[PDB]
């Protein structure tokens, strides 16, 4: 796949739509995230072009998967990332100087800095992008005003150059917002506000996932197949309101209603619908039809064909070989969803690469009841020290390609990172021998303000000097989302070995959370801050507190003190350190 761009190159035709982007590199992101775009042509600021034709990003489709290139000055082009194995995000931290990006202007408050303006935009239910007038702006009336904006697409309706002004996008898709996600799905209720769009969805999960990446969608209603009107089954209405809430909730039956989750975006799957839909046919434009032994082999053929967005498989239910119908549409979605014709339908997985990797499903493999195996806790790592001889020191969790999150108190009088050894996918400590490969820590990032474990600011990062080939034995866990502050985890689990006395096999044990208030009582002499969380009634220092929520695993806490294997253990409150982790990693 062709990630780089093209100095002065234009693609001829394909014109699907035309939008305004602040740069080619971001135009490439739009292209990637659009359900039909393969390639694009962006117009830069230049002598050569009328000011109106600038900042123009033209998304295109070709059947051959390329178009004819034409040497043209000021033009940058132009392939989407759909063809790539690399992960991809829509996070754009760029601030755009002397640049005014246009849309519906809706708050017009006054602000300290470009930064605090961006923060406001990110924290607001409606904000797609902002413009900020610097101290240095002419009109004294206007200088320092931070006006927020939205459009139908999320991109500006126009872009103009204007001196002493700075523009930028919401950073919700950098996991930076503190906007609370509402996960509640209201059944037998409908919503009645504006109707900004609609697709055909097979279930309300899909429906609400589409509400999530649709920029103008704040909430939704799904009319299930069991609805009255024929014309309205599987209809996913995408809604919004001036306030941002649904005004009213009607009892109105066979319909589910929910909210966007743009805020908890990473940590939840969005683009990845791995599920199959049985006796279900997805209507759309046919692209190929091929012999296929399983409906799985159908998916793999859809996923492998870049233009394919979804498929139906027809089982011989004969000679064994099914017909696999690879399909596409205008948005990413069937034009009609039909039941009762014997097909198996789903979607391309070419879309999962956009989802955050710690959201991939878990296998199924064993419940053990007491002890672990093969690939049960692919994020849990054992931390070895070479002094005085080689021993287990801490538990850690994989949270990045290159990163471990763990306790600071773990690194007491460690002088150099060069004494450390991280091992992944380990069960029996027995399994570690000199030949055994390990990751070497490049760097230790202890929190400044850390003094004592019971003082609480107890959190460390290991930058590994070589990255992790992700496997069934070595995958990350997800950080809790700032939107999810009000979440009530009820499926929480401590893992580790013993750390004193150490167990050979990886110990696993499900534990209940315990409220801060409640813990504070049991803990006489020491203060329990909001930057800690508690639990109890069998793991190491730095070991993870992992909670499963909606079949996705979160790193809720890191081990810090505790008494005694009955009083609850104290933990570092990972959510409260999210700005921090993101800061120190990007």
């Amino acid at each position: 796949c062709v990630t780089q761009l093209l100095k002065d190159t234009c693609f001829e035709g394909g014109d699907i739509t035309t939008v305004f982007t602040p740069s080619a590199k971001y135009c490439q992101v739009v292209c990637t995230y659009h359900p039909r775009c393969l390639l694009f042509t962006f117009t830069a600021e230049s002598p050569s072009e009328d000011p109106t034709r600038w900042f123009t990003c033209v998304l295109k489709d070709s059947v051959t998967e390329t178009l004819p290139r034409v040497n043209r000055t000021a033009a940058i082009s132009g392939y989407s990332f759909k063809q790539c194995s690399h992960q991809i995000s829509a996070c754009n931290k760029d601030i755009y100087v002397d640049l005014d990006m246009k849309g519906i202007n809706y708050n017009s408050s006054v602000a300290k800095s470009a930064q605090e303006c961006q923060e406001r935009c990110t924290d607001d239910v409606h904000c797609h992008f902002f413009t900020y007038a610097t101290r240095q702006f002419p009109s004294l009336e206007h200088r320092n005003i931070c006006l927020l904006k939205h459009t139908q697409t999320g991109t500006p309706t126009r872009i103009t150059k204007l001196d002493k002004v700075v523009s930028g996008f919401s950073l919700k898709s950098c996991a930076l917002s503190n906007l609370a996600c509402i996960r509640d799905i209201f059944p037998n209720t409908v919503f009645a506000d504006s109707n900004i769009d609609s697709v055909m969805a097979p279930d309300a999960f899909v429906c609400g996932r589409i509400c999530t990446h649709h920029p103008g969608c704040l909430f939704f209603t799904f009319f299930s197949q069991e609805w009255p009107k024929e014309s309205q089954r599987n209809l996913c209405l995408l809604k919004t309101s001036e306030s941002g809430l649904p005004s009213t909730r009607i009892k109105k039956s066979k319909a589910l209603s929910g909210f966007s989750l743009q805020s908890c975006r990473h940590s939840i799957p969005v683009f990845c619908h791995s599920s199959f839909y049985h006796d279900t046919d997805f209507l759309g434009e046919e692209l190929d039809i091929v012999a296929a032994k399983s409906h799985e082999a159908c998916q793999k053929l859809c996923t492998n064909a870049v233009r394919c967005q979804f498929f139906t498989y027809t089982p011989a239910q004969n000679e064994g070989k099914g017909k696999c119908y690879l399909k596409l549409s205008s948005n990413g979605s069937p034009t009609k969803i039909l039941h009762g014709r014997g097909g198996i339908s789903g979607y391309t997985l070419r879309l999962c690469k956009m989802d955050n990797e710690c959201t991939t499903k878990i296998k199924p493999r064993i419940v053990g009841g007491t002890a672990s195996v093969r690939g049960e806790w692919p994020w849990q790592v054992t931390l070895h020290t070479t002094s005085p001889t080689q021993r287990h020191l801490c538990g850690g969790s994989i949270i990045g390609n290159q990163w471990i999150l763990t306790a600071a108190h773990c690194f007491y009088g460690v002088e150099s990172p060069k004494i450390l050894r991280v091992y992944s996918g380990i069960l029996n400590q027995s399994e570690i021998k000199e030949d055994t490969s390990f990751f070497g820590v490049q760097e230790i990032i202890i929190h400044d303000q850390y003094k004592m474990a019971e003082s609480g600011y107890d959190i460390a990062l290991l930058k590994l000097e070589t990255t992790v080939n992700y496997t069934d034995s070595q995958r990350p866990i997800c950080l809790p989302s700032k939107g999810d502050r009000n979440v009530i985890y009820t499926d929480c689990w401590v893992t580790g070995w013993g750390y004193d006395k150490i167990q050979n096999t990886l110990q696993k044990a499900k534990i209940p959370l315990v409220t801060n208030e409640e813990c504070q009582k049991r803990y006489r002499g020491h203060k329990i801050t909001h930057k800690m969380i508690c639990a109890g009634y069998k793991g190491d220092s730095g070991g993870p507190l992992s909670c499963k929520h909606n079949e996705v695993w979160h790193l809720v806490g890191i081990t810090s003190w505790g008494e005694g294997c009955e009083r609850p253990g104290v933990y570092t409150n990972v959510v409260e350190y999210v700005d921090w982790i993101l800061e120190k990693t990007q």
Binding site: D100, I104, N105, N107, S108, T131, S139, H142, L147, L162
Partner: peptide
């Protein structure tokens, strides 16, 4: 709507 910048 608010008017935008001059």
């Amino acid at each position: 709507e608010f008017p935008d910048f001059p």
